[PDB]
Amino acid sequence: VMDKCKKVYENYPVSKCQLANQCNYDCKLDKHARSGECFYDEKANLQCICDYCEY
Ligand code: NA
């Protein structure tokens, strides 16, 4: 099974993508991620995506 650096934060309240650093904060605290940010998908719907890799 491929190890993927990024994973959508399941069921995250997208409204929080409006808050600076909030997806990053919640990814790191709630998921032990290295970081997180919100991203627009191909239809421009926002999702909070956690990142488990270092850069
Ligand atoms: Na931010």
- The residues with which 36 forms a beta bridge, in sequence order, are 50
Q: Could you tell me the distance, in angstroms and rounded to a whole number, from the CA of residue 20 to the centre of ligand 1? A: 4
Q: Could you tell me the distance, in angstroms and rounded to a whole number, from the CA of residue 46 to the centre of ligand 1? A: 13
> Is 26:12 a contact under the CB 8 Å cutoff?
yes
Method: X-ray
Burial of 53: CB neighbours in 10 Å, binned 0-12, 13-18, 19+: exposed
3-state helix/strand/coil string of 31-53: HCCCEEEEEECCCCCEEEEEECC
Q: Could you tell me the distance, in angstroms and rounded to a whole number, from the CA of residue 2 to the centre of ligand 1? A: 28
3-state secondary structure of 21: coil
Q: Could you tell me the distance, in angstroms and rounded to a whole number, from the CA of residue 1 to the centre of ligand 1? A: 31
Resolution in A: 1.3
